[PDB]
Design a protein around this ligand. Sequence first.
Ligand SMILES: OC[C@H]1O[C@@H](O)[C@H](O)[C@@H](O)[C@H]1O
Ligand SMILES: OC[C@H]1O[C@@H](O)[C@H](O)[C@@H](O)[C@H]1O
Ligand SMILES: [Mg+2]
Ligand SMILES: [Mg+2]
Ligand SMILES: [Mg+2]
Ligand SMILES: [Mg+2]
Ligand SMILES: [Mg+2]
Ligand code: NA
Ligand code: NA
Ligand code: NA
Ligand code: NA
Ligand code: NA
Lengths: 1011, 204
Amino acid sequence: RRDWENPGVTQLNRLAAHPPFASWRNSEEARTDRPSQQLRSLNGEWRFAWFPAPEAVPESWLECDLPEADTVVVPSNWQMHGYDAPIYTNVTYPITVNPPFVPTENPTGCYSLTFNVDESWLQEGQTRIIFDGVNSAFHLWCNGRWVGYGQDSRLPSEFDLSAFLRAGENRLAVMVLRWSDGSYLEDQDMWRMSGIFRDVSLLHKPTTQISDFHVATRFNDDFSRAVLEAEVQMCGELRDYLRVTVSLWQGETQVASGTAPFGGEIIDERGGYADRVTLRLNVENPKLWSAEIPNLYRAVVELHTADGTLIEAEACDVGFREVRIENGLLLLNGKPLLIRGVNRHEHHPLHGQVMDEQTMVQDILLMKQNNFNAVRCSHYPNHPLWYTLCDRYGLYVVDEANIETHGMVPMNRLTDDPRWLPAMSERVTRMVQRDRNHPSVIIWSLGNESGHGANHDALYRWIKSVDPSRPVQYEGGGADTTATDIICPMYARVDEDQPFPAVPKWSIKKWLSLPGETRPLILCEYAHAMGNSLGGFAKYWQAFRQYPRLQGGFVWDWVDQSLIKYDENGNPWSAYGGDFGDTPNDRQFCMNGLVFADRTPHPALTEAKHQQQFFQFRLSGQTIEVTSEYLFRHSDNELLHWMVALDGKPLASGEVPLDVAPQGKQLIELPELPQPESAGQLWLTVRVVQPNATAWSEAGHISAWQQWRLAENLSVTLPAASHAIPHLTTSEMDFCIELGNKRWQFNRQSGFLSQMWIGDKKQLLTPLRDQFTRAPLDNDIGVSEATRIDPNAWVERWKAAGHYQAEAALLQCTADTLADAVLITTAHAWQHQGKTLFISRKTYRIDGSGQMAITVDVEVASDTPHPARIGLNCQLAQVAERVNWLGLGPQENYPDRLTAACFDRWDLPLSDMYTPYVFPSENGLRCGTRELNYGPHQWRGDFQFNISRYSQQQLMETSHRHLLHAEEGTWLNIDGFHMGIGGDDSWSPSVSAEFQLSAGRYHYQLVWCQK
Amino acid sequence: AALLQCTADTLADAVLITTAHAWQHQGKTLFISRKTYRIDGSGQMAITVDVEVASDTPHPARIGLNCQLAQVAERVNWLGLGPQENYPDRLTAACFDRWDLPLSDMYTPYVFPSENGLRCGTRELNYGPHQWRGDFQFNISRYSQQQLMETSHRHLLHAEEGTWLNIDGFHMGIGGDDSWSPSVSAEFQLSAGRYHYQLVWCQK
Ligand SMILES: OC[C@H]1O[C@@H](O)[C@H](O)[C@@H](O)[C@H]1O
Ligand SMILES: OC[C@H]1O[C@@H](O)[C@H](O)[C@@H](O)[C@H]1O
Ligand SMILES: [Mg+2]
Ligand SMILES: [Mg+2]
Ligand SMILES: [Mg+2]
Ligand SMILES: [Mg+2]
Ligand SMILES: [Mg+2]
Ligand code: NA
Ligand code: NA
Ligand code: NA
Ligand code: NA
Ligand code: NA
């Protein structure tokens, strides 16, 4: 029996699913959520042996430990211990597509544990074992006797061991198969791992026990009154003396309580459920739960005899909230939500797919700190503690069935097949049975990228029947099928339609109004944050705020799935697809995170924070209008800090309390401000600061900001005449200009500034020359590969047009000495195989003060692909500690990703001017810069720049950040213009037209001077 | 206009004039215009214009130069968008080609007079013996902008001596979503703060 090659067999002897149990035998412990002596953890050191196929495991292992086994920690994924390689594949399955069969070489993990059981557990009641996560399928033996089997890598499998155990020492044997028929439903875009990767526990329940319970909360029209209804089911000895008492607590106060014997209402001609009871508790003015204020009550479910003996108690946290879609809007407690969401896979760079409390808390803190209020469990039910944490800290959750068959062709081949209805049904029904009482879960999802099959329609209806309290969504088959209550596309653009046949991705604004459509639209995935991305993010937020039925979306995704590898010297480095010998693989497609694998933010995180702010600001005169986007709370932990500065020089600042009701406005009249007469632009910057620490943030946390230009005094003052005049010396090969301690050398053959001296020290390692290209970003490459070029990708268009290899041809190079300066004029043409792609005309004016004014005018052929940038570059000889600029910052910012940046005076260590994206590319740009200072140099103009120890050539040629090497000196790229980075998706061109350099003619000017 | 600078330099084959001016109002500088005029041995005069517009002043209607030419010629010939009047937010119907019309066709007789007759996207303009090359928008007519703004009805306009030529590096859109509230879309307002344009005036 190859049960792992039969979708008709998804378990053997497995117990029914139910919500979290702990079988407390004391009600106060259940009320306080203290640990239960009846729920033990079997996590720790286990014994493990790897085999290449199930046929290789020896019979002896059922009864005795294998000498050659190792001791390892469980939970774990065995690839993380090095027994075999993790595989990174996106769409294409990791095994041959031949359902329901899997490879005969099927890595098999033999786990075993010798553990204790106290006789007391065996004198009465039932002892079960619980495996919260085993990937992908497994057989279980206890004391050498076969117990059962399970599939579905992401939900708990439980077995009754009552009849198999003995007092004292017992031994478990778990044979885990890497591949099974369940793998056809587990093709999510992530590392393919295996093992006992979630907790293992032993739970003692009494013979007469609570076998399931469901909590519902219904409200009156204004939410001032609610009824809590709790349906409780029992298994075991049914007798009239039994009762259930459900009590509801708010802290130490008992708010309501009801007791009843078993026996539910008559439901049909054969009667009712003699083994169930429904308690209804009235609760006046309940404290409501939301992500803004996660108010919770504690429901304790006591199973007891009427005369007072507690048999056992179970319990849960309850959040009073109503989720309903009405008139096309998704409402929470009667108000329309605005989903500031993110998709989050369970990933740790050292532990793989094993989740730990610290990591989950670290993730929720950072999410909330960055203005997220919702998370989608892409693409499977999560470790159970996740839900508890979202209930308590307050995040809206989309709980998703572990069903993804992306690699099938067509994508609904299995989901439309009734033979796969049974395996799919279990992944949906068992998730609902387990997670239906958590208030954080607000929407159920039927899985991901499995097309649209009749099995989705059947399952949509199942959930709508069993749980009317939450909408059900599902994106497959075109995002607006009959199996979804919410239009939930992935990567639909704001304004641009992408009319693919069958499953078009309409502009989200257009999609809402298609003939006959009325549902709300919340993207299940948008803003693919792969590498240097998040370009256009603000476009989505402006739309969400303007259109009521556009209720947000979930960014893809939270954290890069990079894994740690160690080099010869034993230093850690971030690996991606193929780095473990895995092939085929999808390379860096596993890193799409707002944060690196160790939780350090990528620069895009601050853009998300800012666009997701909960306060909107308008300025009129010196009156600030603050509007709150909270739906339920007043701004009771917030103050507004304001500062006025003249181009970086602070002039005045203050603080004012913010007191704005949800959806309300507050007007703030600022003080008679700073009105300087000196040149420069005045600017107002406001920040919302939370004075008090919270569960998720420290005191002084900044939650929102905004900046505006106030008055501008243009400079009309004339520089003093200089007491000098540069001298020019000419040779056939060069133009040399000298002025005091300074010297400039222009090569007449190449037409560029080849060297500059200060004091008598050389300043350049490479000449100053025009640059029209960039080391391609993930979004510029998309899915292109050398074995399979994608000619539509930006990088491929640039390559084919010759941008990377065009050579400068000199058309003119002259020198003139003026009254007080020397003027160098040049013109160059860049061509490729006959074609003139760009023309650069410039003047260099060096005056008696030592300043060099550079004016550049470029022409770009209308028929060549728009270039990545229009700028100059050079390798400076100096390496300095800091970079100080007056411009946008302080973090990396690009034209379509700079809303979060503020114009000010910034000063950072050189290293901060480089963003260590795992897959190297153009990075660290800062835009809107008016003055840049590095060592003895100052550059002034209105440009964008980056500066670092790595050339664009080096970044484009190196596949991993740890292989980069600082070059001599510092490479400076200063651009008049730079293309958008895009990111609406990372597999088709996504830079919006307005961010492409298509103007044909460009002008920029800089002044390079000393100090 | 207040002068900030006016210098002259001779180069190997040309003379270079450099000027800078500020436009001010009640002590605030509204616009700064920096230019170079380079006159070569070919008789061509290359004009480069770099303008600054204070961020807190309302976005200006246009950024260009103007003059009243002494002569009057019968035709206007240009390589640009046409043949009819077109403005930035209303130029989709125009085509880029070589157009030649009588001067009067370059004036649109709106009953209530205003700025009119612009053609955008022009790379070359010919009038009389003169030729202007660059990438600009222009209007040319017997009526000054001053007259147009002071005159309420077209029948009261009178041809001035010569020809008024307005040549714009940039021009604001005209709007029209309605005619009782500001309707020029953001993308058609001159809000960039710094603007550059260049032209060559030469003799044909
Ligand atoms: O990085 C590509 C992303 O593509 C989406 O289509 C998918 O649902 C995600 O799981 C992820 O694969
Ligand atoms: O003083 C610097 C400032 O100059 C203003 O003209 C500009 O609008 C601002 O963005 C900033 O560059
Ligand atoms: Mg099976
Ligand atoms: Mg009691
Ligand atoms: Mg006993
Ligand atoms: Mg997929
Ligand atoms: Mg590959
Ligand atoms: Na909305
Ligand atoms: Na991915
Ligand atoms: Na407050
Ligand atoms: Na690279
Ligand atoms: Na008028």
